[PDB]
Design a protein around this ligand. Structure first.
Ligand SMILES: *[C@H]1O[C@H](CO)[C@H](O)[C@H](O)[C@H]1NC(C)=O
Length: 7
């Protein structure tokens, strides 16, 4: 898995 917030 990979984290990539977007908010
Ligand atoms: C995490 O980053 C990886 C790097 O390519 C992918 O883009 C993947 O889709 C990302 N996961 C999420 C949940 O955005």
């Amino acid at each position: 898995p990979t984290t990539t917030p977007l908010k």
